[PDB]
């Protein structure tokens, strides 16, 4: 029993991050085979960072201005390109860590571990999810950017997410490992607003089937409700909307508690409406939102 | 910016994680150098831990009866000895990823990394407190026993926790590595009451001046107090008194906000007596307590 914000383990990430400097500027990049992703914006000086135009900048770049560094061992960079908002930098020597991977785009409300990294060394890692708006809410400083974001399953690293830009509002925004941004961010700064926060309904519902699962059941009611009413309350408090995929989703968890998606959404429903009444749900005073259906299974069932 | 629940890299302990099988207990186990550690109860039917006597069980055990698998290969077993609530079993091969490593004993309200694992594969990792009353508030199922958990010094890794006991009450119960339980918890399926989960006073003023470096200040008030003052006001809310040595500890968080510690007493003790009033902080609606100083100093600085 527990019930645990928890990441991935880093192990098979952290042997792929390397130090990527071109001038002043140094963050991390990500060595997979012989190439190595990192943010294009390692070639700005911030004063170009208002406005680059990073062809034009990349120009006066050759190989041997991208100092790549993996441990204290320098890589030989024999070729560069940019895709979208990423260099890839491809380097003499495969890296012998290479973990079986792939590069996927997420989607919002979907999951994910970040390893902070600075100057290509690991500091740490955490859970985050993809918010509708197509920020994360991170834990990032100057030296971060490269850091990567990923889940795993059993051998095969899917990497989702690749550290750019902080916001003015201290939530983050990257790209994918293709260099697209989530959302309608640039990697320039500039007035850059996020829109609304909302919260990832078909999560929030995970965590309290994972709640009744370890325990925690004073939330449970006499009621159920229908997704068009549900939704009605879920638009006044800025919840997604909830779709029969979601329902579905939730199929397996709602058959091993017993309990109908339909009542937990009602269960839902009468929190959002009467709130916590100063009482905790698997130690949170709010409804957690960054925990998938996926996560939920895998954590209640221990999938290695 | 922004603040999270920040886990150690978990590479270093992956690289050490095995499988150890008794009879029909399969379990996890720590390899260091050529010594497996694991949970003693591995070597009990689930008849056997109403009343085990563990020394008569051991003696039914041969080397040749402890099955330890790291990957895909059988490691060879020349020796078992019991410590404490520990097993350690020798190998006849020094685990080549052994890490740089301590065995540490930590005090309650000091955090850590679990790498919760299942036959010797780690399935996540998460931050931990050891509560005031001895326990942690995990995330194991059957299995995850002998999960470890962890701190990093750069490349040393100090093990503080192994995974034991879920209570009653779904709280986890553990050892040092030397297979001492934390607390008053013995291996045995009995009547055992965790005592006052009290709140880890230092560890919320910490996280509060995490919040002001990170832009949340609503909290901040015009009040000060006195340690005895601010001692009235935590005794009648399970908080743990703080001291002079807390105060000190808090120091470096105190000189780089400008916000005295008794100041930011103040503004914890009116949070105390008036609720957060449906506002949050660094996303919480609750008071964070697992985040030491040196957490907040370690994350709010970007260390590797
Ligand atoms: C995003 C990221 O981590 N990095 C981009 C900014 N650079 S930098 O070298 O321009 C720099 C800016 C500001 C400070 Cl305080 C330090 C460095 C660092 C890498
Ligand atoms: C603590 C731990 O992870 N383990 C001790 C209990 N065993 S077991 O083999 O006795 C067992 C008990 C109950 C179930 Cl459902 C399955 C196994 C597993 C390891």
Redesign the pocket.
């Known amino acids: 029993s527990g019930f645990r914000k928890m990441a991935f383990p880093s192990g098979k990430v952290e042997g792929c991050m390397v130090q990527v400097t071109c001038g002043?500027?140094?963050?991390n990049g990500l060595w997979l085979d012989d190439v190595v992703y990192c943010?294009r914006?390692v070639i700005?000086?911030?004063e170009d960072m208002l406005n680059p135009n990073y062809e034009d900048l990349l120009i006066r770049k050759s190989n041997h201005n991208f100092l790549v560094q993996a441990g204290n061992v320098q890589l030989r960079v024999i070729g560069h390109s940019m895709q979208n908002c990423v260099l890839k930098l491809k380097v003499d020597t495969a890296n012998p860590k290479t973990p079986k991977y792939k590069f996927v785009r997420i989607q919002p409300g979907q999951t994910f571990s970040v390893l902070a990294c600075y100057n290509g060394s690991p500091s740490g890692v955490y859970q985050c999810a993809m918010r509708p708006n197509f920020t994360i809410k991170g834990s990032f400083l100057?030296?971060?950017?490269?850091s990567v974001g990923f889940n795993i399953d059993y051998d095969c690293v899917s990497f989702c997410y690749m550290?750019?830009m902080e916001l003015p509002t201290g939530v983050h925004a990257g790209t994918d490992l293709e260099g697209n941004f989530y959302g309608p961010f640039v990697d320039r700064q500039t007035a850059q607003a996020a829109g609304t926060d909302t919260t990832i309904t078909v999560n929030v519902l995970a965590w309290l089937y994972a709640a009744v699962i370890n325990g925690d059941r004073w939330f449970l009611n006499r009621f159920t409700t229908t997704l068009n009413d549900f939704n009605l309350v879920a638009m006044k408090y800025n919840y997604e909307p909830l779709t029969q995929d979601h329902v579905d989703i939730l199929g397996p968890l709602s058959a091993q508690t017993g309990i109908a998606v339909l009542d937990m959404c009602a269960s839902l429903k009468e929190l959002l409406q009467n709130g916590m009444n100063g009482r905790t749900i698997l130690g949170s005073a709010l409804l957690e939102d960054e925990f998938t259906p996926f996560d939920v299974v895998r954590q209640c069932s221990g999938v290695t």
Chains 1, 2 share one sequence.
Do not use: I, K
């Not at 002043?24 to 963050?27: A, D, E, P, V, Y």
């Not at 100057?142 to 490269?146: A, D, I, T, V």
């Open positions: 002043t500027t140094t963050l943010p914006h700005c000086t911030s100057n030296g971060s950017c490269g550290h750019h």
